[PDB]
Every structure is written in structure tokens, then in C-alpha cells.
A = this chain, B = another copy of it.
Amino acid sequence: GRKKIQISRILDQRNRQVTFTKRKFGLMKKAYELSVLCDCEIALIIFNSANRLFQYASTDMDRVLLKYTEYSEPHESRTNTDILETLKRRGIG
């Protein structure tokens, strides 16, 4: 964008909702590309601040979640903390 934004809660309600709508599509778009390019199955679940539910599934949500119940544990599990640290880490060298 015209200016680099820090990663912290957007204060302005109008701008927060606009960024939400466009970044949400951007994320689904990238999920779609990832599923086709690398032949994987993807599900995305998003709850906004008002607890409204937005979802995306490369194939069918029912299909992806049913399959998830079949696994005892993931091969890889990440959270914001993990991503933040990986980013903080690369910041040095």
C-alpha cells in the first residue's frame, strides 16, 4: 500500500471493516491457489469481531472436517505465537 502498516488492531472501525473484507478475499484466493498448485485440501474458518462466521473449503467443508476427525494429531501445528517468533527471528539474521 501507499504506506507500510504495523501489525496491530486497526483503530478506525470503517478501515478495519474494509481491510477485513479485502484481506479475507486475498487469503481465500491464496488458499485456492495453494490447493490447485500443490494438490492439497484446504479449509479456512474465520470469526470476525462480531462472531459472524466466514468460511472457505477448497473442496467441501463437510468433507474436509470429516477427514480432520480421522486424525489423532497434526504433522504440523502453528499458532500466532509461532509465526510471530519465526518473524522476529528472521528480523535479526
A residues with a Cβ closer than 8 A to B are 5, 7-10, 16-17, 19-20, 23-49, 52-61, 64-65, 67-68, 71, 73-80, 83-84, 86-87
Contact = CB atoms under 8 A, between A and B. Distances in A.
Count copies of this chain in the complex. Answer: 2
A29 B56 CA distance: 17
9 smallest beta-carbon distances between A and B, as pairs: A20-B38, A53-B74, A41-B47, A43-B45, A54-B76, A56-B78, A32-B83, A52-B75, A39-B49
Contact of A47 (B37, B40, B49, B77): B40
B26 A30 contact: yes
A59 B40 contact: no
Contact of A83 (B28, B49, B65, B67): B28
